[PDB]
Structures are given as C-alpha cells and as structure tokens.
Amino acid sequence: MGPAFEFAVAMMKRNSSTVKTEYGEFTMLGIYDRWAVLPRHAKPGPTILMNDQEVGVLDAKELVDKDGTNLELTLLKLNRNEKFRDIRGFLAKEEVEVNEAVLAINTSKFPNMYIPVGQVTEYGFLNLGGTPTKRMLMYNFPTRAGQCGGVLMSTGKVLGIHVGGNGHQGFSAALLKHYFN
Amino acid sequence: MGPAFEFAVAMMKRNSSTVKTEYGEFTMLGIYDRWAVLPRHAKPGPTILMNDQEVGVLDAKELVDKDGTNLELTLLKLNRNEKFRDIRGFLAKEEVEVNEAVLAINTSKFPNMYIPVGQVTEYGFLNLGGTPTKRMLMYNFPTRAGQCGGVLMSTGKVLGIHVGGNGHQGFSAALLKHYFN
Numbered sequence A, B: 001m002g003p004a005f006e007f008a009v010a011m012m013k014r015n016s017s018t019v020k021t022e023y024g025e026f027t028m029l030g031i032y033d034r035w036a037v038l039p040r041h042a043k044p045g046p047t048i049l050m051n052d053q054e055v056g057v058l059d060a061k062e063l064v065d066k067d068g069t070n071l072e073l074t075l076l077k078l079n080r081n082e083k084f085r086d087i088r089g090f091l092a093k094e095e096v097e098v099n100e101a102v103l104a105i106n107t108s109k110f111p112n113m114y115i116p117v118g119q120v121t122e123y124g125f126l127n128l129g130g131t132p133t134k135r136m137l138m139y140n141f142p143t144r145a146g147q148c149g150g151v152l153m154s155t156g157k158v159l160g161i162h163v164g165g166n167g168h169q170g171f172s173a174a175l176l177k178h179y180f181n
C-alpha cells in the first residue's frame, strides 16, 4: 500500500483544495484546465469558498447517465488564472475495482488525512439520500460527515469521489475519463 | 513516504487499540508483553475501555526524568492473556528527528487515519497545559482533540506518542527504548 499512499499524497498536494458551499465543507479535486469536481449535493452556487477565497463559478454540470439517472457528481468551471495539472490520464474509462485503496480528505474537520479503506467493489445502483444513483464504488469503512469530495485512489489510479455512506460503508461516485471530454 | 505509510499501517494493525478513560478517547500503542502506553493526561484508572472492553490495569507508571520533570507518558500493564508483538526494536535510544513522518490515529473521531506531518524536530522543553515537559518532538500540523495517543512513525521507526498541540503545531512525547527496561 506504500505506493498507493505515495501517489495519493502527491495528487492531493497538486490538485486538491478545500471548498465551502452553502451545503457544507468538501474536498475538491481539480481535473484539468479550470474544471474540478464536487459531490452533486454540495450544490455549488455562482460563488464558492476555495481555500478561504471567494471564487467565481463560470459553469457547472450535474452529471446524469443516458437515462437521466443521478451520478452524484457536479463538474465546475472555475474563474481563476491557474490551471490544474491534467490528471485525466489517471481516470479509468469504466468503474475500477481494487483490493486496496486510499481515501484522501482535505477539510477543516480532516486536514490532509489518508485512510486505507480496503477493497473497492463496483456496487452499482444505490438509493442515496432517496435518489436512485448509479456507478457507485463501495468500501467497508465507517465514513462520516466532512468526508464528502474525499478522493479515492490506488497506485496511479483516481477511482472516484466520496459522496455518501450508511454508517458502515462508504460510497464514491466513479470518476470516468469521458466526463471530461 | 510510501514506506513510512506502509510501516505505519502494519504497526497500527498489529499493536494499536482505541482506549477510553474518564479523561477521553485515545489511541493506545502496545509495546511488548502486556505493557502499553498512553499520554499521561489520559489518567487511566484501575479499569479502562479497550476496544469497548473493560480491561484491568495491573500496573501504571507516569514517567518523569531524573529531575522529576514530566515526560507526559504513562506506561500501563494490562490484565489480558494476549501479549503485544514486541516492538522495542523500533524505539530509539534518544529523540529522533526525521524529515517526513506519519502520525497514525485510531479513535471513534479518527478511525484508521494517517497524516503526513512533515519534519519532526527535537523541540525539547515545552510548557504543556501549564506543566514543564521534556523530550518533546514537534511537527507543523494543526492537531486536534481526539488525536492524543496518536503514533508518530517513519520507515522502521516508532518516534513518539502525540500528547498535545497549540492549534498550529503538534507535539509527541519521545518513546525511548530504556522506558521499557
């Protein structure tokens, strides 16, 4: 798991931030150019707090599948000059299952924390907070509030973003290459 | 830092537990035989909760130096049949400074979490919660309540146990080989 931690630490350092919306505090992962991702339930407005700074949101897309089923991801285009390091190469084309993953959080409640969550399984459909949701990845860890936007990784792979939990399992939305063109 | 995470994960799995005393919830590291360590301020009584179990404490020693100066460590002898894996080989004879360390926590507030804290420096004397305290190791991380008993490690080294913080820095008491005979 050493390499999985090592990759995760470098990825959070280069591409992650702490974001506040009206709906809470989240980890945010920048993907390429000025595009980043949040759990859909963060419900970013015209403005967000990004590491304490008011940042303008030029575009936001709540992702759904071809049937309109919720995927629980919102892509957002940031009004800022810096671009993110392009990490689309680390995103799979389809849901990845691994035996050992690391979930990385960066919030006030959990600043620079890394959790080895064990096996990730393609969970599939989940009734999440009452909304039918697809392309969930599941891991047996007691995830809690303050961990949404959590980045789920293994060595050289970004698997998904943490979006919910039932007190005993956690769930990430799979972060697929085609979401980013 | 990969190897430092890898060592830390294996060490917590084999030798750590979650302990409640009247004074809070702590990470506890077992050292050898039935001997473990807590921050002195956990103030373990005749009985502690060890992973939800009432466990008897046969002996407890609050460590002080040759002048009687506080070291902020309490060694405790547990009344249980299992012995800990002997990890005295990973303890230094004197305070270790490293460039990259991992602090590992295992509580309800922070179950199986690992934090890369950066450089550890021999801090020396510290007025901790009003008590003169020696042999502190310092790292620049915003440590919080719920992280005491936190185990500070680098590759193949157990450096100390987290005992306090000022909101911007954290401090571990050095865990020295001679404390354990």
Ligand SMILES: *[C@@H](CC(=O)OCC)[C@H](C[C@@H]1CCNC1=O)NC(=O)[C@H](Cc1ccccc1)NC(=O)[C@@H](NC(=O)OCC1c2ccccc2-c2ccccc21)[C@@H](C)OC(C)(C)C
Pocket: A023, A024, A025, A026, A041, A126, A127, A128, A129, A130, A131, A143, A144, A145, A146, A147, A148, A149, A163, A164, A165, A166, A167, A170, A171
């Ligand atoms: C992240 C928010 C954050 O960072 O805080 C800002 C400061 C947070 C993390 C999760 C909370 C608890 N565990 C976590 O990991 N995510 C949420 O709170 C998320 C919000 C949300 C998502 C989508 C729409 C609207 C809001 N909500 C939940 O995670 C949700 N849990 C849930 O839906 O559980 C699924 C269950 C399920 C599916 C199918 C069949 C049966 C069941 C079932 C049975 C019994 C319990 C759960 C489930 C919240 C609202 O939690 C409960 C469990 C109360 C529903």
Ligand SMILES: *[C@@H](CC(=O)OCC)[C@H](C[C@@H]1CCNC1=O)NC(=O)[C@H](Cc1ccccc1)NC(=O)[C@@H](NC(=O)OCC1c2ccccc2-c2ccccc21)[C@@H](C)OC(C)(C)C
Pocket: B023, B024, B025, B026, B041, B126, B127, B128, B129, B130, B131, B143, B144, B145, B146, B147, B148, B149, B163, B164, B165, B166, B167, B170, B171
């Ligand atoms: C661990 C407890 C835990 O797991 O909770 C159970 C559920 C906790 C972690 C630390 C809290 C905040 N940051 C942490 O990492 N440890 C303590 O609370 C610890 C308890 C204690 C230790 C020893 C005797 C009695 C109680 N207390 C503190 O960490 C303490 N901080 C402190 O003393 O700071 C040192 C400062 C210092 C030294 C020399 C010169 C000047 C200063 C200075 C100036 C200004 C601020 C701090 C210091 C607590 C009580 O915090 C404050 C900062 C309020 C004193």
